[PDB]
């Protein structure tokens, strides 16, 4: 049971394109989420009786910046959390969430960054996906660009989403060219590059750091969706992905029995294991999310309805759907986020509203 306990509206009236709970917060500290929209990022604290305590924002000096996405990590030496933000200017900002100071930034991308993700096992490895058709992997410890995943066989239009698998050995990306593409980062070459990125200190050498140019995916398919693929997530070795066709497909590369690590780039088949249908979500840039454990799946649609899927069933097609509505919630939900313990679900909207659902 989720019940709606509170809502609010940010003062800029622009779309909130993203929301992330900090899953690296300390034991005993209150639960905290960031929202991104307009040219800002804002942090809030969850307290009892549905209260959403407004903390502090970071506002970009450029009036024309528009933040699209954010991701949490932490400093690897001090335990302290960090929040990365990015959007239309194609600039990644690493923000100290306590003071909201911009610690540092990365340029390179030829255009808008549509999503950011951190590696599940290495808090320094930041993946950005761009409107310039490419993904980039950054080491935010040594401030190095580890690799660009692109080229003619990479995406031929905007990359909209990507996700590391559980161990962070491979990436799956999706975008406007209707395709989902796989990029392994556990090859000798990539493990070497990450290692070399850690040994790099510009003060102690003469060389620039050389990026990898990865121009070939380890698998590709245009067979799942017939429009823009705007969100992707690993579910073990299986994939969850959506287009703007009111469906989330659960699928895998190759045939039913094929091992994901034995899939070759020539692979021609995919296997569909289920599809979760819903209504009125035919605009693009609409992201579902999952809880920490991947027991559930949340997606908002374009008229303010929420869909939650219970994934704690023995095959993906057996997922149990439930819905959450509120008569005052009628604007489009761009993204959802669960607290780490899944007691709270947050939805953020095109009219700048923030909706809080408690279990």
């Amino acid at each position: 049971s989720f019940k709606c306990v509170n809502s609010l509206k940010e003062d800029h009236n622009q779309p909130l394109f993203g929301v992330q709970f900090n899953w690296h917060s300390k034991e005993g500290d209150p639960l905290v989420f960031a929202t991104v929209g307009s040219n800002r990022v804002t942090l809030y604290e969850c307290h009892s009786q549905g209260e959403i305590r407004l903390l502090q924002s970071y506002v970009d000096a450029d009036a024309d910046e528009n933040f699209y996405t954010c991701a949490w990590t932490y400093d690897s030496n001090t335990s302290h959390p960090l929040l990365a933000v990015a959007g239309s200017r194609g600039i990644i900002r690493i923000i100290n969430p306590i003071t909201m100071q911009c610690i540092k930034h990365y340029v390179g991308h030829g255009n808008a960054i549509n999503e950011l993700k951190f590696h599940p096992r290495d808090p320094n490895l930041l993946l950005s996906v761009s409107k310039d058709h490419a993904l980039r992997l950054w080491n935010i410890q040594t401030d190095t660009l580890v690799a660009i995943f692109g080229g003619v066989e990479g995406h031929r239009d905007e990359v909209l989403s990507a996700d590391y698998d559980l161990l962070g050995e491979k990436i799956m990306s999706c975008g406007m060219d209707h395709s989902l593409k796989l990029w392994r980062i556990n090859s000798k070459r990539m493990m070497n590059a990450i290692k070399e990125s850690y040994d790099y200190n510009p003060n102690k050498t003469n060389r620039p750091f050389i990026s990898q140019k990865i121009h070939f995916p380890d698998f590709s398919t245009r067979d799942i969706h017939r429009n823009y693929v705007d969100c992707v997530r690993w579910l073990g070795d299986l994939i969850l992905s959506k287009s703007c066709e009111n469906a989330i497909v659960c699928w895998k590369p190759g045939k039913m029995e094929d091992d994901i690590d034995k899939i070759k780039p020539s692979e021609s088949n995919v296997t569909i294991l289920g599809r979760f249908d819903y209504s009125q979500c035919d605009i693009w840039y609409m992201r579902f999310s999952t809880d920490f454990w991947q027991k559930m799946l949340a997606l908002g649609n374009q008229v303010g309805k929420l869909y939650v899927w219970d994934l704690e069933v023995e095959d993906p097609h057996k997922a149990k759907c439930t819905t959450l509505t509120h008569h005052k919630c009628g604007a489009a939900i761009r993204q959802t986020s669960f607290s780490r313990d899944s007691s709270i679900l947050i939805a953020v909207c095109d009219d700048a509203s923030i909706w809080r659902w408690d279990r």
Binding site: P15, Y228, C244, I283, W284, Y285, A332, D350
Partner: peptide
């Protein structure tokens, strides 16, 4: 495909 309605 539109980004918004």
């Amino acid at each position: 495909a539109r980004k918004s309605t």
